[PDB]
Design a protein around this ligand. Structure first.
Ligand SMILES: *[C@@H](CC(=O)N1CCN(c2ncc3ncnc(Nc4cc(Cl)c(Oc5ccn6ncnc6c5)c(Cl)c4)c3n2)CC1)CN1CC(F)C1
Length: 272
């Protein structure tokens, strides 16, 4: 129910990690009052130019995930309120999963890749339990706590303006009508799995975004990754069905990748 407010004196910014349309993320340290501890944190400072109604949707989305949560989705530790709005969370020291897979292409195993697929599916199952549509699931928006533990973050939203999109991850209905559901998140999950299994290849590389809807209706899809057996590719293909009702549920995806994770060398073919 309650919300933990952290004073400015409890927090210290060290380095800039990244940014987007809504805010700037810093690496930092949290020292809670009346405790002899240091906690490494990420601190997201929201931009001052944006209106009150625009920043409202970011905060309200965090407050839905109030109770126990999931270990595979980012957890808000608290907020700090100066002239700026500062959102505080546990630091994920290996950064985003897209950068991680590209760097470690030489030494990653079949067990590691399929474990990540299962963990992302478990995290998305929790977001469906609390009725939270992500709108922007991609390898860039999954963080790495360690090589055997990943967390979903960077929850998507349209910027509300007074006046004064990731097309290659989106379901067909989302491109043409701007309809976002739990079943459109499943499409984006399929593309995320394709990124991991290609060691961070760019989807539809060379094809302009305007051409994507016509190609999808014709039946063209992203190619089978070189390391994947057909059994793995079949799950990706089910995620990209035009009929949203025929796509698998996130709980069924947890079941499938858990089974494949119990015999990873059968399903994914690494050189080593
Ligand atoms: C990927 C590169 C990339 O984009 N990033 C990796 C480096 N950065 C980074 N590193 C570690 C880290 N740990 C923890 N948290 C963050 N980022 C973050 C994100 C959000 Cl959305 C955030 O706010 C909320 C809001 C609501 N909420 N509810 C529950 N939890 C939360 C969190 C916070 Cl406080 C912190 C983080 N970031 C930046 C990300 C490749 N990329 C492709 C090229 F463009 C490079």
């Amino acid at each position: 129910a309650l919300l933990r407010i952290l004073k400015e004196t409890e927090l210290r910014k060290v380095k800039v990690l990244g940014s987007g349309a809504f805010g700037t993320v810093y690496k930092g340290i949290w020292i809670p009052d009346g405790e002899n501890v240091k906690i490494p944190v990420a601190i997201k400072v929201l931009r001052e130019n944006t209106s009150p109604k625009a920043n409202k949707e970011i905060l309200d989305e965090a407050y839905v995930m109030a109770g126990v949560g999931s270990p595979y989705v980012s957890r808000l530790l608290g907020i700090c309120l100066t002239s700026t709005v500062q959102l505080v969370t546990q630091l994920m020291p290996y950064g985003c999963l897209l950068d991680h897979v590209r760097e470690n292409r030489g030494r990653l195993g079949s067990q590691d890749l399929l474990n990540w697929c299962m963990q992302i599916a478990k995290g998305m199952s929790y977001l469906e339990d609390v009725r939270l549509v992500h709108r922007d699931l991609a390898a860039r928006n999954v963080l790495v706590k360690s090589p055997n533990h990943v967390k979903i973050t960077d929850f998507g939203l349209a910027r509300l303006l007074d006046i004064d999109v990731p097309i290659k991850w989106m379901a067909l209905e989302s491109i043409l009508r701007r309809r976002f559901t739990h079943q459109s998140d499943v499409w984006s999950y399929g593309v995320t799995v394709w990124e991991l299994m290609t060691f961070g290849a760019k989807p539809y590389d060379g094809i302009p975004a305007r051409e994507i809807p016509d190609l999808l209706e014709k039946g063209e899809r992203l190619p089978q990754p070189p390391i994947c057996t057909i059994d793995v590719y079949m799950i990706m293909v089910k995620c990209w069905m035009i009929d949203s009702e025929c796509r698998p549920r996130f709980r069924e995806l947890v079941s499938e990748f858990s089974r494949m994770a119990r015999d990873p060398q059968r399903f994914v073919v690494i050189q080593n």
